[PDB]
Amino acid sequence: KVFGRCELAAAMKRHGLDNYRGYSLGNWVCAAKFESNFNTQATNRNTDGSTDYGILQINSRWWCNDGRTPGSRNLCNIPCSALLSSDITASVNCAKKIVSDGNGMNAWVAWRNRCKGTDVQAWIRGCRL
């Protein structure tokens, strides 16, 4: 599914992402915009055999179980396929762990390249949630 800008903002807010760990809602919306273009089915296969999944392009190396190494890593305790659901619950809950892992939102390259240092409030402008 491809979310609308404010539709996603509303959903993320519903899941308590607004100001989570000091990161305003606009940061999360901006991140999704440039990581997957608001597409929950977005998948990115890296040249290392790993894959980034979903709306927030979470990498399979550490955060989910893709069936190749059960019992290993999988810090979010979920099958990577769960990150491809139209229901963003899994992606959001896993993102909360990622953002608390010590590198803030810098764990998302698209965010650090196109969102960081900008007025992310623009991403929720007109949403009046």
Q: Method used for this model?
A: X-ray
Is 35 known to be catalytic? yes
Q: Which residues pair with 58 in a beta bridge?
A: 53
Resolution of the determined structure in angstroms stands at: 1.6
SS3 23: strand
Please report where in the chains the tokens 């999944």 appear, as a residue. 53
Eight-class DSSP state of 22: T
Query: Hey, what CATH topology would domain 1-129 get?
Result: Lysozyme (1.10.530)
Residue 101 marked as a ligand binder: yes
Distance CA 22, CA 129 (A): 19
Cα separation of 117 and 99, whole Å? 17
Q: Exactly one of 7, 35, 66, 119 is catalytic; name it.
A: 35
> Is the separation of the CB atoms in 78 and 64 below 8 Å?
yes
